[PDB]
Ligand SMILES: CNC(=O)C[C@H](Cc1ccccc1)NC(=O)[C@@H](Cc1ccc(Cl)cc1Cl)NC(=O)[C@H](N)Cc1ccccc1C#N
């Protein structure tokens with residue numbers, strides 16, 4: 001029993017983290033086979049960061065301008081290219097610790113593990129959700145750019161995030177591993193703003209199911225609701241609309257607990273309209289929205 | 303910026319997890335050099351679990367009664383012994399992935415990372431505090447016994463916890479790696495109860511400092527308090543007494559933020575007496591007590 005925010009074991013990713021240096025700029029890279037992936041703004045100086053033309057900046061670089069360190073071993077760069085906002089450095093050595101892997105671009109509401117790194121060295125692991133406004137609420141200091149986010153599925157690592165920048169509000173923005181930003185953001189040092197965020201409804205429902213699986217039932221009621229009438233209440237409280245596909249995804253949890261999805265929606269509706277009145281759910285006084293239905297099944301199996 | 307509950311990267315420990323089987327009982331073990339450490343109740347049958355005499359049960363075992371699997375490789379047991387509540391199996395192969403390590407017995411209020419494992423295979427990582435009543439609030443299913451808790455200090459893994467059992471209240475009890483239980487618990491399948499728990503005051507104060515370091519100041523006030531008068535309020539709200547040593551430990555955070563420890567104690571006193579009034583601190587509506595002062599410095603450096 002118990003329910004905890006749980007990251008994937010990070011070892012398969014730790015063996016891929018390296019340090020990339022160009023001039024005075026140092027950040028983290030991901031070494032898979034004989035290619036190192038890192039944020040392309042590693043080629044920028046501080047003055048370049050205002051409004052860089054990256055094609056221009058990269059054409060002025062040669063292979064020996066890039067320093068790649070794996071542990072205390074220096075890797076020789078033998079080619080370089082740019083794919084969207086990621087720099088790819090071909091090195092002369094294949095990473096012997098390369099796991100089975102894929103690159104995946106996730107949807108808002110999905111979660112992943114972040115391996116926070118500094119100078120190519122991992123410092124900690126935590127769970128994040130991609131917010132509906134395509135930011136994540138991470139923990140990142142200077143030097144963390146290039147840290148990656150990932151899921152693991154039967155010894156296959158699915159990389160889904162590379163960290164690029166902190167926005168003025170303190171939330172974080174980044175790309176998939178093919179260099180495409182999540183959201184409308186661009187990689188230049190100007191004040192960009194995230195859109196207004198909303199709560200991930202299907203995830204809150206998953207977490208309420210986790211609470212029932214763990215014996216917490218106080219928030220249930222005898223009522224049900226229609227999908228349409230639930231969504232009218234969702235809008236008012238800044239919750240994302242629940243779709244029929246969300247209902248279908250929650251099927252397994254609904255079957256395990258005996259609580260129909262729209263019955264749990266009636267519980268959430270009442271929780272939104274009256275609050276918790278001092279009680280907690282799985283140790284929380286706020287409704288939690290960073291557990292997917294998959295996260296719940298993975299941790300609550302049985 | 304940002305503040306997240308963060309585990310240590312788990313890779314150095316993943317390479318040590320193995321599966322131990324005796325009869326029909328299977329659980330996790332920790333393989334360091336040529337010794338495998340696991341909970342001694344692996345030698346018990348279901349009938350034995352009511353009131354076992356472990357010396358009696360172990361004297362009836364031979365080396366070949368123990369099956370140790372590392373990945374898809376079987377390890378040969380060449381000796382066995384009991385140290386308190388841990389079984390030690392000598393195997394014919396030294397673990398080539400053995401990290402630099404120590405065994406440490408921690409105090410209540412200290413935190414550690416847990417690598418939850420099933421059948422010798424890691425499933426997830428999360429942070430735990432040792433509660434004042436010597437339980438942890440983990441996430442553990444059947445088969446998780448033998449999962450370990452650890453801290454990492456400059457590539458040295460300090461193992462501090464091995465999981466042994468879930469209590470009726472759903473909280474978790476275990477031993478140090480030398481087999482001594484934390485708290486009054488014993489390894490037999492009877493209903494034992496944890497003592498009443500209390501809040502870890504020095505940790506709440508550390509987390510309030512983390513909030514200030516991250517720009518959250520709304521809970522501060524112009525008042526200060528004496529240590530004695532703070533502790534009178536602490537008792538009333540089931541908080542552990544704050545000692546002068548706790549004050550000293552918070553020195554670095556106090557110096558970084560400019561807020562004297564007893565000034566922050568006045569903020570906590572007011573938060574306990576009036577609640578939050580709908581506001582949050584670092585995203586939480588409850589006061590958090592599972593970050594040590596060390597945890598805060600490690601994540602908020604700068
Ligand atoms: C109080 N908030 C801050 O000080 C963060 C500040 C907000 C801001 C941004 C813009 C205008 C005004 C204010 N942003 C940065 O300093 C950015 C600059 C930057 C670099 C490269 C690109 Cl492509 C884009 C950008 Cl915007 N630097 C980074 O994000 C580092 N990679 C890591 C890093 C360094 C320092 C602190 C946090 C983190 C993280 N994570």
Ligand SMILES: CNC(=O)C[C@H](Cc1ccccc1)NC(=O)[C@@H](Cc1ccc(Cl)cc1Cl)NC(=O)[C@H](N)Cc1ccccc1C#N
Pocket residue numbers: 001343351442443444445446447466467468469470472474488489490491492493494
């Ligand atoms: C609703 N709560 C429960 O069902 C848990 C139940 C509470 C209880 C305990 C006692 C009397 C009545 C009720 N405890 C266990 O079933 C224990 C039994 C047990 C084995 C060995 C020793 Cl030395 C001591 C003990 Cl007590 N088994 C384990 O803890 C497994 N190692 C892992 C495990 C299995 C299943 C569920 C959770 C977990 C975990 N973690």
